[PDB]
Write a protein that binds this DNA or RNA. Sequence first.
DNA 1: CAATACCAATCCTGTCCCTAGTGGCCCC
DNA 2: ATTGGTATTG
Length: 1320
Amino acid sequence: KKYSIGLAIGTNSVGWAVITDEYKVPSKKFKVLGNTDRHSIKKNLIGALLFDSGETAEATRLKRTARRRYTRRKNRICYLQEIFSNEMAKVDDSFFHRLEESFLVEEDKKHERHPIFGNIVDEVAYHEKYPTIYHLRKKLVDSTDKADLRLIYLALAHMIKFRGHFLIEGDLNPDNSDVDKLFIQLVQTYNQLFEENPINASGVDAKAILSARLSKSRRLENLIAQLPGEKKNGLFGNLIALSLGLTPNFKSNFDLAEDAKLQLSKDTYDDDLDNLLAQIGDQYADLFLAAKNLSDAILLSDILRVNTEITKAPLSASMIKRYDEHHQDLTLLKALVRQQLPEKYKEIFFDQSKNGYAGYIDGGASQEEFYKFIKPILEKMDGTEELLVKLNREDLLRKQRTFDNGSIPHQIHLGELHAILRRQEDFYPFLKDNREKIEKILTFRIPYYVGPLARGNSRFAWMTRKSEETITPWNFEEVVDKGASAQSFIERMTNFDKNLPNEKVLPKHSLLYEYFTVYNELTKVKYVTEGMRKPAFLSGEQKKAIVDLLFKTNRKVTVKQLKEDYFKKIECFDSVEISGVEDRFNASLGTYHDLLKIIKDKDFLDNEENEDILEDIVLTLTLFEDREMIEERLKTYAHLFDDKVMKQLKRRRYTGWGRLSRKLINGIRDKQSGKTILDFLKSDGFANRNFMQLIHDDSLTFKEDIQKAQVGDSLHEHIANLAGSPAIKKGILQTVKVVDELVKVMGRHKPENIVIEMARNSRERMKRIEEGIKELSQILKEHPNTQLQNEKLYLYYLQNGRDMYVDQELDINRLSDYDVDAIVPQSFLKDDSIDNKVLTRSDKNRGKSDNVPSEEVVKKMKNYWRQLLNAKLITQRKFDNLTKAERLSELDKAGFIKRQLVETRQITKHVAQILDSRMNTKYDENDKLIREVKVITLKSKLVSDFRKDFQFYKVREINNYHHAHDAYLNAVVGTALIKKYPKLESEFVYGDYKATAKYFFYSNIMNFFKTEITLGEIRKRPLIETNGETGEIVWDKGRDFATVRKVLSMPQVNIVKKTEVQTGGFSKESILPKRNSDKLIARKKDWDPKKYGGFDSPTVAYSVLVVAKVEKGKSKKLKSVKELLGITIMERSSFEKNPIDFLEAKGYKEVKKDLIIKLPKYSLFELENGRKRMLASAGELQKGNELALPSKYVNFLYLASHYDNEQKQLFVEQHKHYLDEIIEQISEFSKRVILADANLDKVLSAYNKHRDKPIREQAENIIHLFTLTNLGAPAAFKYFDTTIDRKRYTSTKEVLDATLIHQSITGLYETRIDLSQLGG
DNA sequence: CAATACCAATCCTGTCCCTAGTGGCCCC
DNA sequence: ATTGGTATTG
Ligand SMILES: [K+]
Ligand SMILES: [K+]
Ligand SMILES: [K+]
Ligand SMILES: [K+]
Ligand SMILES: [K+]
Ligand SMILES: [K+]
Ligand SMILES: [K+]
Ligand SMILES: [K+]
Ligand SMILES: [K+]
Ligand SMILES: [K+]
Ligand SMILES: [K+]
Ligand SMILES: [K+]
Ligand SMILES: [K+]
Ligand SMILES: [K+]
Ligand SMILES: [Mg+2]
Ligand SMILES: [Mg+2]
């Protein structure tokens, strides 16, 4: 009675099977609970659990953070109103009331309906004088008269509520009055250097050219056009580009060896410019200085389109410009349409349904949709030239609140706000006293490193307070501990040392950590010369000399440097061979050289007395990102260095953390030697033990202390903390629960083996392509995100339109004639990603098809491939695989096959470890683990090839059985494999461990199933396959294949759709207009949706069976009812708080409490003739049955549809009649179970219509036909050209008298409840 | 109670931590 | 994308 378990783990399924030692699947009677006829039922021990995908937490986080922003924005407004309260009460005692109730209809308002002034005359006059808020803002900035306090409030509130971005540090003071003079000064500073070839700036309208509503590049070309004998990539062209906010590279201008890319807005610009000047000289400093100056005058030319000398509110003035031009152009456009085409006027100016001006102002038409609609009308008419110019510049009839306003920095709104306060504090003293408070309301932003301002009821918060009092924007620095909070921000996320779990890991860039890595790599180097009899380790003296002479003088140390600069120079070896390092050392002392460049004091860095200091410094530079806090924490060391060194130290930042703590690296000491780990790495006799040897050596104390330092998650908590998609982690937890249930089903006996198999954006594509092209091209100009989902076109755009194996251009319109080749051939590496694929004219040109692209191709194309790699168009892996010919060995191919068959993904190993640790808990007399259950892992290709070899074909579309069948085949193949070759356990069993030959072995490892094999030459194998030593039979080709065939043909498979309560958003999010419908849901308690609109379409968390009574007619007589009420996600807590009260408030009486059944989505019901339905909601049903199509039809559909061999084609043609039979099957299933008369008859007519089609296409569309009979939600499908739309089951009445089936996770344990016995 | 046809909030900036895959060193 | 909600048409 021994057995094994097969498992197929997916993101929406767990297939499972129990097999005996004869590869059979047992069947058992299981008790059936409930109130029906049936006491028990037969069940095969094979099935699959289906489930909806687990979701990431991202959408939840987006909602959460947006909620916090709405709360805090309301609070900004509340702070402002509180400052205004006393004096506003003297001016207008109900003003803020009128603002708060502005949303209410007149019936519900408690004050006069006109919010600003409370009477119609003043309200109309206000709007006449100030058509937009920006008119008022500009007036209050520029005017010197005392202003009404309510208008002052409205201006300040508009600025605070929509305050612009915080992407620019420091203060911003707009001034575009002398762009021409700054440009001339740049030209003068340039001509100062290049007297021989100066630029004549006379007549160049730089102000107009550089401030036009065009792209930065467009203006760059326009400007260079005006400078004769000057080219766009020249030095002055690059300086203009710099001033425009581009990123020019000054490498070619100065014949440099490295890149000199420069961007003014990058926070690294100062140090980059200092590096460049160190290369070329400080005489060029002024030049870039002048660039900065010009840049400061045109920085915001895009948003500030008005001269700054006329107004201190140029943003509001630019909005007013938008408004005025909109008005003038609207008058002109109306007149032109009235004249040249009157019949269209209405459609353009009245029809909200159309994308005219009506749809633009009143309908749902966007600015883009409106321009696309009206541009043909303009081109068709005469007198529309300037209108078309504005249209093509996205600047025609513009609104002021628009999608592109995100560019406005908060400093501009702050400038207008500060100016208004300065104007009006002369008249209202409270504005003088609170000016800085109001400014702070606008400017204050909670630092990202502080997080929510919680008080112990937020699982997201980490902020600590200095005093227990309410936090405001004004006391924030006094109440909140910014330092401790910024520390917690990082430390709550960083790892502890796995060896010393109470110690934090070191910063990745810690000097100590990098010393550790260098000495750890160095202590396993070995060397030989002529006079030496065997290879020798490096001694402590040698390693110290190597670190001092090489690692502390070069950032990277190459093997050639090791041989010449040390062995030759110091040891006088003319030749030496080195092992333990290839090409260059991996580790390096990067931080040592960074700090040397900064502080220019090698003796300070090499002085061990300073160790702690430097560690702390690096910790500070890793922990904190805010330069002010960096300065605060480094101030305690400012006495050791000067001002410029501290300036450079502040800008020196690191990110990243290591794997080990300082206490582990250089703290704990071996008791007898008194030496740290780093001490041993520096010098360990002639043993030269490295970190792994040191912490495992029983002759040292380290291992004992690690064990003393070591230290209870649940299964759910353990799985949740794994690295992996939430979708696959859901399947992992379900797999473990399935295994638990199956073990209970076998009387709590554990299996012999468990075999597990685990199955295997357009905006990102557009971003990659834009970045690569701008780093490179005008290919999007000549051939302008959805389209990028085409693979060959995607590869074309990623490759700059060139062949990758031949140095030639490729043609867009010829992509169908080209080839997509595997860089590493797919016969070795089953990688189908862009990282291993290439678009070439002909794959023949790769060279020989058995290896990496040939040496000739490498010699041809390595330079172009390096150019591609630099622009980040191919990865280092891709370039290395492309260029491997100059360096595929036989070991590579053997390993490629091995990895085709040996699973190495971390997540599958984690599933294997979970199962292995759950099954195997006992230890033997030697305290070794007792592995009662072997956990085998298989890659999909094994069972896939098994199916394709022995004609156990799968067609996923027929039904869901293929998951269960996959699990069964996994069990069979895995147990057979380790029975035949018991050595392979080392590769296939979790926890077990201690070129042409291995290639041949792993390539023919599965041949023992076959009777004849063709390698190549023919090989023949016996009928009965046995173990190499024990002699136990592992496979009988005369019986076991028939066993598999019988298992795969069994019609009763336990397919179970996991019932799930629905969670998440309450409803569709659209805020719909008002309507007479009880389906509208109020968005606020008192906002009756008949007056105000609201949501509809709530999601049902679960349905509820109610047996009760409802009042009928005017007399209100009671009438028994049985119906399904859907409890929405919003209603759920209220229903569960007290269900009888909830139901009675719904209009039910005398509800039978004990008969209330909670019915989550997918609840299973059986009706007549074995017909089954699943609950889709309280009002809709899904198909509940599986079509058990016989195996012969499945294999026919596979082979005929081309889902080669002659015997297969003869079988397809001899069994053509099968087509009809398959339709018959479908039909007899539908008429019994689907009950879609119209759709079925349309399908039958479509099949009789296309009988004269090729058999291949008829099978390819019969595959589509199974969407009619598939389990689950109805969906539309197509047979050839005819479309069958889904038939929906829009009533749930019939399941109220049907049989409810509660299923356990495997479906083996059932409780059946006849609902016809309830309420009659 | 029919089909049955339409509908579904969207973009964007910045700071940081973590694993894992790739294919190699060196180890338990 | 899918698929359950909704109004509409009957
Ligand atoms: K019974
Ligand atoms: K009223
Ligand atoms: K020129
Ligand atoms: K609109
Ligand atoms: K708007
Ligand atoms: K290396
Ligand atoms: K940092
Ligand atoms: K293993
Ligand atoms: K959930
Ligand atoms: K969900
Ligand atoms: K269940
Ligand atoms: K983000
Ligand atoms: K991220
Ligand atoms: K490794
Ligand atoms: Mg709220
Ligand atoms: Mg708005």
